[model samples]
Target: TVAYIAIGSNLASPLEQVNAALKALGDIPESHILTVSSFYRTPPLGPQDQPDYLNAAVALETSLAPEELLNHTQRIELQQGRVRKAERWGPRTLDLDIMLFGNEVINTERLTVPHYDMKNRGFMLWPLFEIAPELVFPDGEMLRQILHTRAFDKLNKW
Candidate 1:
């Protein structure tokens, strides 16, 4: 499956952390790193007090199932010093999200493909658009259309 992973960090040398996470993704067995978007600095979501986040998106071709890929991502996060906190979107050393896994619509307790908030997030959309301009959602919506929305106005490519 072709997977698009969203990477973000707001703590502990965020740019370096995101870069390291990208490198770690390539090391996953049965997965090939395709391309990655340039990093962007964006205001943190869900908490006004936290530092701005450094965000990027990575494209990969992987043989691993979604659940297995999720485990790899969480493992990398832990290796990067991520500790789940009480805050929903609080700052962290690394945050890895499976943004899309082919055209699959997953709604399991542990994952959601075509990620649940992807449509509304410029941090996810702009970087994804950079790598995949014509990506269509599972519901048939075009990613380019979302890129043109006002929600993308705040993204600062870094």
Candidate 2:
């Protein structure tokens, strides 16, 4: 399955955190990282007291199922020192989210495909557009259309 993921960090060195997370993803037995977007400096979304986050997007090919992939993502988070006890959207070492898994739509207690919040978050879409401008969601929406209303700003390409 082909998957897209959004990665971010704020508490630790953001770029280093993102790079390490990508490396971890690639190390997953059958995962192949195809492309990665540039790192972007984005304002914190949820809480105003946290540091700005460094964000990026990744494209990959993986054989893992959605739930399995979800577990993998959480494991990566743990490797980066993520604490689930923090405030919702509080600063963290890393945040890895499965933005899309092929064209799959999964809605369960632990996961939601197409990320449920993809269209509304600039932190996810800005870097995503930088890496894959032509990507289309299963719902037939172009990425740029959904990105038009967010606080996205281009940063250094990587």
Q: Looking at candidate 1, what is the lDDT of residue 104? A: 95
Tens-digit per-residue lDDT, 49-76, candidate 2: 8878888889888999889988888988
Q: Write the per-residue lDDT of candidate 1 for residues 125-154, one digit (tens) a residue.
A: 889888999899999989887676555666
Each candidate's TM vs. the true structure? 0.95, 0.90
Top of the candidates by lDDT: 1
The RMSD (Cα, Å) of candidate 2 is: 2.1
Give the Cα-based TM-score of candidate 2 against the true structure. Answer: 0.90
Model 2 residue 126 distance off true place after TM-score fit, in angstroms: 1.1
